[PDB]
Amino acid sequence: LNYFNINYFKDAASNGASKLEFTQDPSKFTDPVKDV
Amino acid sequence: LNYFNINYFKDAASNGASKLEFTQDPSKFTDPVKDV
Amino acid sequence: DRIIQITRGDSTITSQDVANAIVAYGVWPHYLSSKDASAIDKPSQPDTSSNRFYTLRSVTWSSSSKGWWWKLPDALKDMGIFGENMFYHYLGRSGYTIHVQCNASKFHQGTLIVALIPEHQIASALHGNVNVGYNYTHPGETGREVKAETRLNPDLQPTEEYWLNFDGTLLGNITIFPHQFINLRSNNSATIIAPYVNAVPMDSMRSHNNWSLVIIPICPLETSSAINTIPITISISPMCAEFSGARAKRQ
Amino acid sequence: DRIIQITRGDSTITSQDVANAIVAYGVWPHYLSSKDASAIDKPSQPDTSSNRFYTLRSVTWSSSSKGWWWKLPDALKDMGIFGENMFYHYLGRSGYTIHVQCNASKFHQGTLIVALIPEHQIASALHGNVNVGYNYTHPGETGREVKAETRLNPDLQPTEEYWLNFDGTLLGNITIFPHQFINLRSNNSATIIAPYVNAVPMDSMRSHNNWSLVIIPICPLETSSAINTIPITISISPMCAEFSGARAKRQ
Amino acid sequence: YINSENMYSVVLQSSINAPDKIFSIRTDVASQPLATTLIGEISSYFTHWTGSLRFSFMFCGTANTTVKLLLAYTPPGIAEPTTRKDAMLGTHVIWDVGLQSTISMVVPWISASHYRNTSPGRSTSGYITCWYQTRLVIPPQTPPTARLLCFVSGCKDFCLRMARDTNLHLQSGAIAQ
Amino acid sequence: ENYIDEVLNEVLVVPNINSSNPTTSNSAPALDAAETGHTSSVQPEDVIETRYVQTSQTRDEMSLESFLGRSGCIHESKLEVTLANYNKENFTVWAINLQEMAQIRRKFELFTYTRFDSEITLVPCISALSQDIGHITMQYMYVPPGAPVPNSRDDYAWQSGTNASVFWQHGQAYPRFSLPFLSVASAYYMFYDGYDEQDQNYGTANTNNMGSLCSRIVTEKHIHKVHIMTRIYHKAKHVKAWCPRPPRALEYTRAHRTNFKIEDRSIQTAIVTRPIITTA
Amino acid sequence: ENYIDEVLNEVLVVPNINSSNPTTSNSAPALDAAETGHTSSVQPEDVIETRYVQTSQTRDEMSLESFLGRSGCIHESKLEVTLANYNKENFTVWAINLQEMAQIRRKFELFTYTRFDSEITLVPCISALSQDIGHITMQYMYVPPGAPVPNSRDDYAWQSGTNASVFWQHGQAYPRFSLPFLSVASAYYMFYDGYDEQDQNYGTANTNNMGSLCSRIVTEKHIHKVHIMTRIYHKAKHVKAWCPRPPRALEYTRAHRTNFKIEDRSIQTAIVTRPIITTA
Numbered sequence A, B: 001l002n003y004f005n006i007n008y009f010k011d012a013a014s015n016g017a018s019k020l021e022f023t024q025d026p027s028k029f030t031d032p033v034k035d036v
Numbered sequence C, D: 001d002r003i004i005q006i007t008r009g010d011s012t013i014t015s016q017d018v019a020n021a022i023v024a025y026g027v028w029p030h031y032l033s034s035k036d037a038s039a040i041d042k043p044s045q046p047d048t049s050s051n052r053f054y055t056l057r058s059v060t061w062s063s064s065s066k067g068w069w070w071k072l073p074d075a076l077k078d079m080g081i082f083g084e085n086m087f088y089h090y091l092g093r094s095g096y097t098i099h100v101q102c103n104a105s106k107f108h109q110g111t112l113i114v115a116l117i118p119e120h121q122i123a124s125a126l127h128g129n130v131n132v133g134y135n136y137t138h139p140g141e142t143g144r145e146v147k148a149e150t151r152l153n154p155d156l157q158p159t160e161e162y163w164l165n166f167d168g169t170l171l172g173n174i175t176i177f178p179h180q181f182i183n184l185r186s187n188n189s190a191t192i193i194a195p196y197v198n199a200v201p202m203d204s205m206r207s208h209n210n211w212s213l214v215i216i217p218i219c220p221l222e223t224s225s226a227i228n229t230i231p232i233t234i235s236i237s238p239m240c241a242e243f244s245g246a247r248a249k250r251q
Numbered sequence E: 001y002i003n004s005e006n007m008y009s010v011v012l013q014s015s016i017n018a019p020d021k022i023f024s025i026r027t028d029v030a031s032q033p034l035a036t037t038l039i040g041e042i043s044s045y046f047t048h049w050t051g052s053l054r055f056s057f058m059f060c061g062t063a064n065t066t067v068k069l070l071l072a073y074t075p076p077g078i079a080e081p082t083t084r085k086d087a088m089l090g091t092h093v094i095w096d097v098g099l100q101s102t103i104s105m106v107v108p109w110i111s112a113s114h115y116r117n118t119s120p121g122r123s124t125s126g127y128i129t130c131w132y133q134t135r136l137v138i139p140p141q142t143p144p145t146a147r148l149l150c151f152v153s154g155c156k157d158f159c160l161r162m163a164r165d166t167n168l169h170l171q172s173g174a175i176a177q
Numbered sequence F, G: 001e002n003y004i005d006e007v008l009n010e011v012l013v014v015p016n017i018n019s020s021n022p023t024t025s026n027s028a029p030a031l032d033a034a035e036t037g038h039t040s041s042v043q044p045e046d047v048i049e050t051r052y053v054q055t056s057q058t059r060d061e062m063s064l065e066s067f068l069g070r071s072g073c074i075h076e077s078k079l080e081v082t083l084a085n086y087n088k089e090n091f092t093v094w095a096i097n098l099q100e101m102a103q104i105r106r107k108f109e110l111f112t113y114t115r116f117d118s119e120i121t122l123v124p125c126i127s128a129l130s131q132d133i134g135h136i137t138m139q140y141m142y143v144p145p146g147a148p149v150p151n152s153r154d155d156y157a158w159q160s161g162t163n164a165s166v167f168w169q170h171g172q173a174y175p176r177f178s179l180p181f182l183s184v185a186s187a188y189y190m191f192y193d194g195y196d197e198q199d200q201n202y203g204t205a206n207t208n209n210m211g212s213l214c215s216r217i218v219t220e221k222h223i224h225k226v227h228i229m230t231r232i233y234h235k236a237k238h239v240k241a242w243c244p245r246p247p248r249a250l251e252y253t254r255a256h257r258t259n260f261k262i263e264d265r266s267i268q269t270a271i272v273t274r275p276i277i278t279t280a
Ligand SMILES: CCOc1noc2cc(OCCC3CCN(c4ccc(C)nn4)CC3)ccc12
Pocket: F096, F097, F098, F099, F118, F120, F140, F141, F142, F143, F164, F165, F166, F179, F188, F189, F190, F191, F204, F207, F208, F209, F210, F213, F232, F234
C-alpha cells in the first residue's frame, strides 16, 4: 500500500531524506530565451 | 482474533510478504478451449 | 466436428481427423500494445505476405526413429517475406499456428508427442566446459534428427538424449508445455496456436529462438503394411508478425 | 521559406535552397481504392520499411556531360524491402518523392532540367527493324549516361539523342512533364512528388516502368573554380507502396 | 590528436568526390568516445540506460563553402556499415549546409528491452556513421579543407537508473592535505 | 475481513465433494481423448457414488509466494586472510547467480520466467586459526556491471561512494537487506534459447548479469590468522512466475548451462527400478 | 497521495513518445544554430515517424537528493597507540574537508555551490598487535575554529564542556550523528576564485574552514599494543546545489587546489585512443 513517517527529533537536520518535488525547469540551462 | 500491519519503509521492496489473491485460473494449463 | 479448417494467408489447411486444437497458455496472438512497448519506431506489419503457412522439408518416421526438434523463428529463416523481414531488422515479434501432419492407415499403430516449449535451452553432449555452438541450434528448416552416429565437432554438439527432453529433464513431464499427441488410431493432425511469449516486448529474430517444436515418438510405429515407413510434415504460420529497427540485411 | 524538410521513412531530407516543390499532375499519392481495384487479394503495405528514401549511386557532371536517365520502379530493384517486395509479387503500385541534389558555389553557373516522364518509351539507336533490349532499359541504380562511344550490341541499344528526349520529340517541349530546373545561381535541390499513374490499378514491377527520371543539362557547367566537376545525387522515396499476388522470388 | 583541442573536430576535404566514410561512433553512451562528455560521464554514474540521443553537428567552414553530408544511425544486430548504401538503409538525416550552420538528428531509443547497460562490453547499441552525400565544394581562393563539430545531449526521452560509482575517474595515490 | 481470514490461513479454498448417485446414460465423462493436449475433466463424483464432505483444506501454503518465499543458501564465500602485506589480497569476488547451489536453483527452475524482489541475509563465521580472534570487521559491497572492481584489500573502490555496502563485525547479528527486482526486462530468465552478439555463449550467461558481490576484511594489519566464511541466503518476496517447466531430473553440472553429462559416470535419474511390473 | 506515489517510486515522470507522420514543410526543426549557446529542441517525433509509447520510466533516482544522499568515506584516521607515558600522544587531529578522498569529492564538485545537512557515520576497527585487546574506549570531539585544540591524550579540552563529543567502545555499534548545514554563507563553496586578506592561498582553502575532528583513546594506560582505525563516512541530507560544472577529468593532486600536474608522469585523461576514426 502506502507508508508511515514521523520525525522523532527536535532539529531540522536530524530528519531523514527529503521528499521529491517536480523538475519544473525553467529551461535556464537548455533554453534561457531573451526573445522566445 | 486478527493482526496489525504497517510498512515502515520508503521502498516497495522493503515490504514483507505479499497477500494472497484467488487462483482464478483461467483453465489455460488444463483446458485452453478453442471451441468450448 | 473432427474436421478443421484453418486459413491464414493466401493459405488454407484442412484436416478431417484432428483432436480439437490447442491454444498455448490460453492466449491468442496479438499485436504489441502501446503500454508494453519499448522500441519507439513504427513496426512494420506484413499481414498476409508474412502471416501464412510455410511448410518445411518433411522427415521420415521409422521403426527406429527416436525423435526430432526444430527452433523458431529459426526454421523460417529462408521462408518468403517472413524470412527476409527477419534479417532486415534488429527486432521482431510473432505468434504461430503450428500444424503437424502425419497420416497412416487404420492398420498402423504409433504415437507422437508434439510439444512447443518456450526457451528450450538444450544441453551439451559431453561433460566439463563445453557449450553448444550457434550453428547447431540454428539448423534451419531441416531440424535435428536424433542420430546414434558419431558427429562432426562433438564439444559443440547438443546431447542426443531425447527422453531427457534434451534439457536434462524427464520426458513425460514434457506435458506442462503446450502440446498434443498424434496417435494414429485416433488422429492425423496436431494443431497448436501460440502467442508471443518472452520477457521482453520484441527480441532478435537472429540470436534468440523463442520456441522449440519437439516431436518424439513415445509409441513406436508398428505395422504389417507394405509401407512400414511414413513421413511427418511440419507447416507453421506466423501470426500478427511485426518488425522494427530496420537497417541492411544481416547475412 | 526556401527551406524544405521532407520526412518519409525512418528517413528525413533537408535542403536550404529549393524552389517550392512540385506535385505531379496535381494529385498526391494514395492507396488503391475499392472502386478502382482489380486484383481481389489483400495488398501488403510495408509502410515505413518500404516508403523511405533510397539514395542511388551518384553521377558526375562535367563540362562535357550531355545528360542522364533512370527508370522506376527499376532503379529501386536492389533497394531494401521495396526491392524485395518487388520480385516476390506479380503486382505492385507506388508513388514517389523524388529528390535530386546538386550543389556548387556562388562562383559556378550551370542549369539542369529535371523531368519525370510517364511511359517514357525510348527510341532505338539505329534504322530499320531494331528494338531496345530488356537489359538496356533496366540498368538498375546506375542509369544511362549519354556517351559518345561505340557500344556493346548496337541493334539493341537505345538512341543517345538526348535533345530528342530519347523519344524522337523536341527537348524543350520536355516541360508538359512534371519537372523542375536546378539552376546553380538560384537553387540546390529539385523536388517532385508523384502519384501512381497508369491505365491500370496495379502493374508488374518487373516488366513495366511507370516513370523515367531524366536530367539533362541545358546550361553547361562553367567555373573558374578548382572543382570544375561536381556530383548530382538522386534520392527517391516510394510512397503508399502496396503489392499483391505473392509467390516465390523472380530472379 | 589526443591531448589537443583538435580531438573535438573532424576535417572535410574538397579533394574527394566520393561516397567515403568520414567517421563513426559506438552509440552506447558510456562508451568511447562519448563517455567523456556530459551525458556520458553522468550516465557513467549509473548502471542503466534509456532514451533517445540528440546528435547535433556544426559546420565551421567558410561562409562560401558548401557540402551535403549523410548522418546515419544503424541499429544493432549487424556490423558497422561499410558503404554508403549499407548505412543509408537505416535511420538517417541528409544534411545540407547553408545559412544555418547546425543540424540535430536523433538516435531513437530502439532496443529489445526497456533499459540497457551503461557498461555492456559485448552487446552494442548501434553505430552512427557520417558520409559524403555530395562533395565539399569551394570557390577560388578559399581554404580547401573545412571542419565539423559534434554534440550530444539527451531528449525528453532520456532516463538513467541504479546508481553506481564512476569508472571514468580514480585515485591512485593519496591526496595532499 | 482479510486480517482475520489469513490469520487462521483460510483465503484460497478447496471445493467440497458432493454426493453422487447411480448413473445410467449416454454421457461418458470418463471417456475423453488425451490426444487433445487437454487434461481430463473427470471428478470423483463422476465415476463413483460419493458422499457429501465439507472440505476445510487450504491452498495458501501452495502459493508461489509461500514456495519461493523461504531463504536458502545461494553462495558460500571463504576469505582466507594472509599476512603478506595484507593489502595485496584478502577480498572475495563473486559473480551473482541463483545458479551455483542446487536446492533453490531447482525450485525457481520450475518456471521459465520469474519476477520478484529479493531479501539477502548473511551468515558470517570466523574460524579462528590463532590462539585468538581480536576485532574482525567485514565489508560487503555490491558492484554492478561497470562499477570499478576492487583489486586489493587496498583499493579506493571500498570507499563505496555511491555503491551499496553493508558492514559486519564480530558479535553483530546477521546482516540483512532487500533488493528491488533488478532485471532490465520484465522478468528474470531462468532459461535462454539464444546467444550473444558474437554468436557465442549459449544460454543464461547472456541474460542476467547482476555484476558481483565483493567482500573484504576491513580491520587493519594484525597478528591472528583466521578464516571468514560468509554464507549468502536468498528469500523471494512479492512473486510472480510464468510457464511451468518439468523439474530438473539430474544433478547440476555447470551454471547457466543445462549440461547434465558427467565423466566416467552412468547417467542417473531419480527413478527407481523394479524387478517386475506386476508387483509394486 | 504522496505516501503511495513514492512507495513505488513514481513522482517525477518521463514524457511519452507520440506518434508522428510524414512531414513535408518549410519548417525545419532539425535546423538550428548551436552558436546561440542553446541546446537543440528537436525530439524523436520531429525527425522520424514514431509510434505511440507510454513511458513508465522515472527520474526519482536521478534527483540531487538521491545522488548525494549516499555516504562514502571522506577520511581515514589511524591512531597508533604507544606506551611512552601514553599521555603525551595518542590523539588524531584532522582538518575537515570533503576534499581528501576522490570518489565523493568528484560528485559534489559537479556543482559550484552546494547546500545540505550532513550525516556522519563512523567505522572504527581495532587492529590487535598484542596477544589480546582488553577494553578500548575512543572519543571523537568536534573542535570548531577557535576552540582549544587538544595537545595531548591528556589535556583538559577532552572535558568537552561545550563541544560535541561522541564515544565508542569495542562491541558498540557504528556511531552516527547529524550536522546542520554549517557554512557562514548561504552555501558551501566547491570552488573559489579568490584569495585571503593577505593576497595568498588561492582557492577553497579560504572558504570552508570547519575546524577539526580530534580523536583520542580514552582507556587509561594498559599493556596491549593496538592500532585503531576509524573511518569517517558522509551522507548529504536535504540537498540543493547550483551551477553545474564539467566533471573532474584527471586524478586529484592536492586538496583545495585544482592542480592536476604530477612529477615525471604524462598527463592522462580518461579518454581512450583509437587507431582510426572510420572504425569504432
Ligand atoms: C552490498 C550487498 O550486495 C549483495 N550481496 O549479496 C547480493 C545478492 C544480489 O542478488 C539478489 C538476487 C538476484 C540474484 C540475481 N538473480 C538471477 C538472475 C538470473 C538468473 C538466470 N539466475 N539468478 C536474480 C535475483 C544482489 C546484491 C547482493
